[PDB]
A paper describes a structure:
Here, we report the biochemical and structural characterization of OsUGT91C1, a glycosyltransferase from Oryza sativa, which is efficient at catalyzing β (1–2) glucosylation. OsUGT91C1 is able to catalyze the addition of both glucose 2-1-R1 and glucose 2-1-R2 with roughly equal efficiency. It also catalyzes a third reaction, β (1–6) glucose addition, to create previously uncharacterized compounds. The enzyme’s ability to bind steviol glycoside substrate in three modes underlies its flexibility to catalyze β (1–2) glucosylation in two distinct orientations as well as β (1–6) glucosylation.
Author numbering: 15 to 161, 202 to 459
């Protein structure tokens, strides 16, 4: 089949969609991977032996005054600037005509699109190509949904879609997946957990962060990362910083800077000085796969993005969960329900947190002998499912057979 994949302008979407693209190409299916030029330049290089079977289609974002040149992703357009977020959404909506023009001449058997791509689902109807809507989250997340705005956009894409795609399996969610066959009438297929193929991401294993981990003792480092886009204000960064200090663990912290915050104001006064030997803060893109693979990393303080949840658990790491928005909350609950993680206490009404809640979560998961060994033993039990690569390939084989019918 010639499958056209158009992921949402977010590395949380672009990365797993490129893994999918390559898993399809490995079965000898042609993929057209449709996105913007800079997002594509920033992706892992394709496996050379699959290079002709993953065609990249670079649709330039229309230049919307106010959205600066290169601001093509959620990683580039900050959430703490709502104005720019909307300019990014409008520019993304400007890809409609060029996407329609492309799909016309594509000879496409399927179009797989994200929930934001109402205009791509429209082009699929225009050119009589069956359109699968990606909801590459937990079965629990989809159950939670089932129970122009983004909701209008979701409703509109879903109505024009023949199929809904989830990223889980009965092995990981026996309670949800069996009874979850449709979403507002549209049939749901789960393509497995699709854990990343480590080689696949083509990260730098000589990165300073990984060399730093080599020096640390086994299962001793709390990796801290909130994925690629979720906002965290300077005040909240400070609470997370002081929380990491108070718990007293070795930490590696992949931190994105809030907008308009100097390197001087970003962290608490003397924070790096006081933690020099024990902790490392990186305000750049880190090789997350290499870090989580490392024997020095014990627990993972995550925002519970589904990619990060799956990456964390495939290397048997118990989770310290700080969900910010969207799928994160339900993803946190599901892991908490499986006793392989603990949520940071949150003030009800505002969803805020403090250094004390942060510290108590880290202690319970990573420090206190009895609680930590429970969380580790349970993360390891989940690892048996999440890292069963053969299982998740059989689910990709299953998903292809679904597309043929
Ligand atoms: O410094 C970083 C930040 C993010 N990621 C990757 O970006 C993806 C983020 O996806 P997730 O759903 O976990 O969070 P999102 O960015 O979608 O909120 C994951 O695959 C991470 O491994 C990374 O490799 N290094």
């Amino acid at each position: 089949m010639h499958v056209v994949i158009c992921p949402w302008l977010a590395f949380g979407a672009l990365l797993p969609c490129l893994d999918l693209a390559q898993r399809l190409a490995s079965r000898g299916h042609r993929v057209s991977f449709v996105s913007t030029p800079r997002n594509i330049s920033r992706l892992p290089p394709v496996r050379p032996a699959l290079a002709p079977l993953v065609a990249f289609v670079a649709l330039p974002l229309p230049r919307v005054e106010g959205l600066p040149d290169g601001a093509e992703s959620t990683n580039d357009v900050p959430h703490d600037r709502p104005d720019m977020v909307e300019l990014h959404r409008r520019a993304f909506d400007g890809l409609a005509a060029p996407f329609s023009e492309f799909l016309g001449t594509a000879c496409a058997d399927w179009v797989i699109v994200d929930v934001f791509h109402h205009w791509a689902a429209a082009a699929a109807l225009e050119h009589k190509v069956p359109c699968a809507m990606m909801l590459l989250g937990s079965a629990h997340m989809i159950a939670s949904i089932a129970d122009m705005s983004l909701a209008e956009r979701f409703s509109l894409t879903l109505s024009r879609s023949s199929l809904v795609v989830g990223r889980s399996c009965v092995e990981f969610e026996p309670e949800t997946v069996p009874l979850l066959s449709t979403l507002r009438g549209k049939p749901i297929t789960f393509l497995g957990l699709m854990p990343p193929l480590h080689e696949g991401r083509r990260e730098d294993g000589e990165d300073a962060t990984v060399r730093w981990l080599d020096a640390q003792p086994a299962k001793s480092v709390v990796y801290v990362a909130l994925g690629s886009e979720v906002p965290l204000g300077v005040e909240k960064v400070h609470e997370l910083a002081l929380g990491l200090e108070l718990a007293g663990t070795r930490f590696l912290w992949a931190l994105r800077k809030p907008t308009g915050v100097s390197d001087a104001d970003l962290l608490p006064a003397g924070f790096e000085e006081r933690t020099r030997g024990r902790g490392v803060v990186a305000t750049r893109w880190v090789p997350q796969m290499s870090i989580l693979a490392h024997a020095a990393v014990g627990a993972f303080l995550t925002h519970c993005g589904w990619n990060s949840t799956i990456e964390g658990l495939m290397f048997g790491h118990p989770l310290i969960m700080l969900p910010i928005f969207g799928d994160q909350g339900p993803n946190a609950r599901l892991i908490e329900a499986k006793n392989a993680g603990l949520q940071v206490a949150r003030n009800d009404g505002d969803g805020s947190f403090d250094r004390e809640g942060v510290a108590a979560a880290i202690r319970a998961v990573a420090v206190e002998e009895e609680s930590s060994k429970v969380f580790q033993a349970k993360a390891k039990k989940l690892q048996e499912i999440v890292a069963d690569m053969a299982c998740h390939e059989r689910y990709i084989d299953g998903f292809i057979q679904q597309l043929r019918s």
